[PDB]
Design a protein around this motif. Sequence first.
Motif, PDB file in Angstrom:
ATOM      1  N   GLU A   1      74.063  27.881  62.773  1.00  0.00           N
ATOM      2  CA  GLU A   1      74.946  28.035  63.917  1.00  0.00           C
ATOM      3  C   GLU A   1      76.350  28.260  63.420  1.00  0.00           C
ATOM      4  O   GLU A   1      76.633  29.240  62.744  1.00  0.00           O
ATOM      5  CB  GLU A   1      74.880  26.798  64.810  1.00  0.00           C
ATOM      6  N   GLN A   2      77.234  27.330  63.771  1.00  0.00           N
ATOM      7  CA  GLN A   2      78.526  27.247  63.111  1.00  0.00           C
ATOM      8  C   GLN A   2      78.338  26.898  61.649  1.00  0.00           C
ATOM      9  O   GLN A   2      79.222  27.139  60.824  1.00  0.00           O
ATOM     10  CB  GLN A   2      79.388  26.216  63.822  1.00  0.00           C
ATOM     11  N   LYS A   3      77.175  26.358  61.320  1.00  0.00           N
ATOM     12  CA  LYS A   3      76.653  26.427  59.974  1.00  0.00           C
ATOM     13  C   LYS A   3      76.943  27.787  59.390  1.00  0.00           C
ATOM     14  O   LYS A   3      77.768  27.940  58.480  1.00  0.00           O
ATOM     15  CB  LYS A   3      75.147  26.242  60.028  1.00  0.00           C
ATOM     16  N   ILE A   4      76.270  28.779  59.957  1.00  0.00           N
ATOM     17  CA  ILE A   4      76.445  30.142  59.523  1.00  0.00           C
ATOM     18  C   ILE A   4      77.918  30.504  59.511  1.00  0.00           C
ATOM     19  O   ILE A   4      78.382  31.169  58.585  1.00  0.00           O
ATOM     20  CB  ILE A   4      75.605  30.999  60.475  1.00  0.00           C
TER      21      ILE A   4
END
Lengths: 185, 28, 267, 34, 439, 39
Positions: free
Chosen positions: B1-4
């Motif tokens: 997600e905001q991971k990415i």
Amino acid sequence: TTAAPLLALLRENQDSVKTYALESINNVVDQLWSEISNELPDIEALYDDDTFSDREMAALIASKVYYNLGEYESAVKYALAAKDRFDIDEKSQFVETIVSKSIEMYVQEASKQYTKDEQFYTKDIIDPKLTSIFERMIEKCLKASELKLALGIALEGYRLDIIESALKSKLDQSTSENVKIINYL
Amino acid sequence: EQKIQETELKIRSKTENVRRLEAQRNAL
Amino acid sequence: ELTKSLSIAFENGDYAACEKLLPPIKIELIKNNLLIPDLSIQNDIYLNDLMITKRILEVGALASIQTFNFDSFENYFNQLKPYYFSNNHKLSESDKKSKLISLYLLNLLSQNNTTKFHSELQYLDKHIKNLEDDSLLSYPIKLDRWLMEGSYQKAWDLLQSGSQNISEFDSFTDILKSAIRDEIAKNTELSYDFLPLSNIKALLFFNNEKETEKFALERNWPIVNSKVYFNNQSKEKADYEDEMMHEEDQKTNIIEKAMDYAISIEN
Amino acid sequence: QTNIWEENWDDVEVDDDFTNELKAELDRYKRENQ
Amino acid sequence: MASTAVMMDVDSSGVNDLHHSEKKYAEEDQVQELLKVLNEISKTTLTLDPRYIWRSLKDLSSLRNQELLNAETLCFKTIEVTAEINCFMHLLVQLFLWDSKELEQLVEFNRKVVIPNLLCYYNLRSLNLINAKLWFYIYLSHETLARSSEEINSDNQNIILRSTMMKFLKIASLKHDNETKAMLINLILRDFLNNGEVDSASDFISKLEYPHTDVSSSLEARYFFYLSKINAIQLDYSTANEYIIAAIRKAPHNSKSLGFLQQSNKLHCCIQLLMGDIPELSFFHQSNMQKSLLPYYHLTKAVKLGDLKKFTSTITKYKQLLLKDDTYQLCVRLRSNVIKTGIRIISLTYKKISLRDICLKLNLDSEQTVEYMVSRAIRDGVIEAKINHEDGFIETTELLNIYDSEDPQQVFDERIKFANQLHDEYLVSMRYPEDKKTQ
Amino acid sequence: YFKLKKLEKEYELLTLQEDYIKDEQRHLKRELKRAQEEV
């Protein structure tokens, strides 16, 4: 307030109380995990105690601390441990972080599994919990219902299972898009 | 997600000593 | 209720019996919500019910310490600590709360964890206002004065005379005595290569020197007749702390290698 | 304290010279006693 | 006027409009710059009656008026979004006691600013546009309580706040979710310094420093500041001072040097005490007591001798001032330390002195406690000597070497290790013009 | 998640694009230093 009372509670008997401990502790873990950070070995032993049920609490509790410790595979592992204490739709950034934090971990595994097998994902090698939650996020991505979101994941998720189904499911021929969504990916 | 998401920021931040060495290649 | 059972039991001494009254009473106060300091205002709990809940801590702690249990004691005191000190807690307050921490600092003191010991004084909300007003609190500090730098003379005497040592505290008193002297032991070690087995004992406040002799030989001190020796006052060599800090050229070469990397990483 | 002195070490201390001279007598006077 | 007041904020919002389209470095540093120039206009008479009208209009702007509380009536969804947030920033600014007194009103407002539509999506978007100080700087005031019955309960709003800052500590995801953070710690730290025992600071340690760069050296020093005070009763001295040494060194503060750096200096002064070093307050004569040093000097003045009474006398005198700064805990120790210090000096300079002549200093002080007292001293090293009472000879060592050892070359190594400081830093900054000149 | 997959992905290229250079340099470093000689 302060968890030394809880750190008190920790080894104090009555798994009931210890249940209560964890639970109670769990609600206030957020601040005091720091204080708590020391008892994790017991907390680990707790999670090693099948006798006491909730210890996934302790696991997830530890996970929280582990975030607050920066420990993540720790946290994830004990987020994995929970499954119950944990839920995806429980929203904490921490959760949503370990939500994320979980997701990633899958990929490389999957990649490393994609390495060996290309049907690896069809198989057990990845923690199902992950893969589940992973795909459960894919679900959430499916529910996101912009599946490029799901795709690039499943792209690296390497699951045509995901991909093809999501395609075929979503194939309505979005006439040109279900053509293009393909093309997009 | 905001991971990415902020994964960029690494690369984003990386961008640079590079450009020093760029100046360095010059400087050499 | 089990409430007074313990409360009576404890009151009777008999703390071994009082002990198992606690866990139910423990489960009570959880289910009574009292044990956990209610972060919402309950109106009356602290003094409604939680009064002895605050005391059962004390009570339970006092027993445990009286029984030479400490975690339990502290665990109670831990849990006491918020009711002990919430921040605002004038709501209840109590007295041996001093004695407790006094004991418990003296505990911490005996527990030989210095900063935390002192940082708990620091942690303490009202320190000197509290502290000086408690002799029991006034032991460890004055002790620490004595203690920290290492002259124990009156201190070692002081606790022998200590009214809390006289009251409940003797648990660490003896502990401390050893804990005292081990330092002095090193201090003697430091101070003395050789010392009369007398003087050391005299320093140890021992009566038998075989008392001493054990230690010194537990210490593994060179000893001839009448005299503790230190031929080696220290641990020198002994394995680790190597490969760095006394690698002659190695470090230097590493340092070279390093500086050469200061030459190499110079890119 | 004033503005600019010779500054440090620090003011150290005082009442020595005479105290010495007192003993510069005495010491020597003691040495006169000697 | 209010116009010009607004006009300035127009420029701010105009520079907010810079950040609005991806441009902080301007905006933040401008906002930073703006924060200072904020003192000028200040107030909020027509700035806001003209602001709430200039921007656009939103429910929260209304609930904000509950903070305004006034009467104007008169006549007269995008641009009005983060501006409004950036004005909620200024809302906090309107709270400084600038344009406010009791922020306990604003306390909830703060939350009701902080929590709603804020403390939400902002991870990388808001760049420390949160000021948790100015969040708490509010609560800082009210913590003059005393009064509150702390807080609510005990004191949970702060516990909450801690947990809320904790709720940020989560939000410190290090997505760049950093800058403001360890103020949170610093808060919590000073919260420890209010009540708690820092040592979970070790966990706070365990996380991070305020990583890294764009944090204000101020905080970064203020970081150290409390962080010093960690080692205070952690009884590390250097590192504590090193913090100070890393705090006052380059923390940038003149206005805030005034009351605030004294504080630093105070403990800083307290440091060398911990080591008994007593630098010449000959400087600390200056910008000091007045309101800070001189008890420390008196301490030093005592600690120069370390004459327990004369020592204590200072304490006896200044205890409240000590208590005021809670440096009281200190010095209780250095008492005999300097006593032992003297013991070491102009005294150990024989390979001995006797039992009793060194006991003489204790025959000045005590007897056969000497044994302890000397062992007390020897215990710590801090001197180097031996004795035999069997000899009755307190045998006072050389302390004599040469640089035959790697001891210098340790320092050389120390110097060596530093060889990368400015050397590696030169490369650390080589970039900026060199790289931006390409632009 | 996604447009990163487009977007994000592309930047390891930059990561790489960065990476190459020092190499060139070290050579070039040596290059001078060897060239530097006969000079």
